[PDB]
Amino acid sequence: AAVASAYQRFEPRAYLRNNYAPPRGDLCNPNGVGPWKLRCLAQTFATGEVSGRTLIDIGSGPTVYQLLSACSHFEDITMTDFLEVNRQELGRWLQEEPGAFNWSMYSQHACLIEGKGECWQDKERQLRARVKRVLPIDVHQPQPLGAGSPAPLPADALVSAFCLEAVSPDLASFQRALDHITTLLRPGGHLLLIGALEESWYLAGEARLTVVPVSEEEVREALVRSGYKVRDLRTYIMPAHLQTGVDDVKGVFFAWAQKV
Template identity: 35%
Template sequence: MDCSTYKRYHLHDFDSRGYLDHYFSDHSDMVFAEDSLKFPIEKLTKTFTRGHINGDVLIDMSVGSLVHHLYAACEFFKHIIVLKVNDRCIMELKRWLDSRTGAFHWRHATKHHVEIEGKRHQCEDKEDKVRSAAQHVVICDVEKENMTDPIVLPPADCIISAWFLDGVSKDKDDYVKYLRKFSRMLKPGGHLILIGSLDMTYYTVGKDRLHALKYDEDFARKALVGEGFVIDDCQVHKRTAVSDLIDYKALVFIVAHKEK
């Protein structure tokens, strides 16, 4: 397939439920658990339990309608503000936040998180804490200077962005442009946590093949430093999944802070 025909996450009708089913479910044929579920949960849990990343406001700007990357963070922030690029992603996320019938089942991811914390029997408590913290779900437009216009968000103590830059950036200049916007949303000294896929060019959702920006670890590091961030941690996890749904070679997890 010609890559020029690939759909774009934020520009076309993105099947948020199909995305979750393909890459984050507990289906027996879902081969991405080690990469898309366990790796980010383990890295985020370790990062937040160190105790130096906390505050009043965390902004989440991640692809689709993900939840599992917020389990560790909900213990350390009073408010989680979730930004989404379309109503379909908001509706899917709010189904889970509001405990509605038919919501995506995240309990397998919750179990993995609480087992890491040594709190095996506290799944419901953990999910309730995420629901309590993530009270604000806001639509955004990545091309606007203020992405949430007309709403003006408070400066964030931390931003988490999982696979978002991979999907919205048409090229490396775009990636840097969006990093700059993230920086403006952060307090001086605030933290940015990025989860992304290295050397990826596409991912599949249903019958659609979607564009992904191809970049490597060196580019991500240089882009962050160029925008005034100091990298605190960078971990690369080589791909374990066998599937032609997506063509990444590794995952990257980066923690950085904005220079004061």
């Protein structure tokens, strides 16, 4: 409701520089949040238990790092966002247009930790080839992609990072949004959920956005109540040097959940 108007002033390039340029975007320190997120995803896909033909990324924003390890396990990938200015920034990177964001530091680091000898250009090439479409989405609607969408449903897997808690006024609408995106997932399919812990605001240029502050326990309970078995749930505590003025995040959680 009120989240809708706040996001109308969201600046993609301000969000990217706040969260994916140095210091947070410096991947040289292995104790940083960037390396921790990439490791969570790489370790999960390296188990081999998360696989299929189609995958959907919920609330992509203007970022692609969350699919770097995913893309070699799913041949049809749908990226999504509420904002068209983000879908446009995504398109600029998928089509190698001018002004695209330079994700190569993240592709590089994903290649390092996967340990398959893959060069980073091949990783990026493969991600662009498998992202078939970039669609609008609204996780508040009981059909987040609308009716009859160009997206093959139900998907084998969902990935969502920093969306649900950032679009939800409180714990209850957070739980509904989770219920809503769960309708997109085949039984036995997997959810990879990344989110901020105990956060209440972040800035994106002129936009100041409200976040529901959630704990690890509340994330687990909410995944159960939506019908998931929780395969893994991990926490990163935000160090002082990554506490800038752009938000009040206290930590990051990673959940690997399987729909029963």
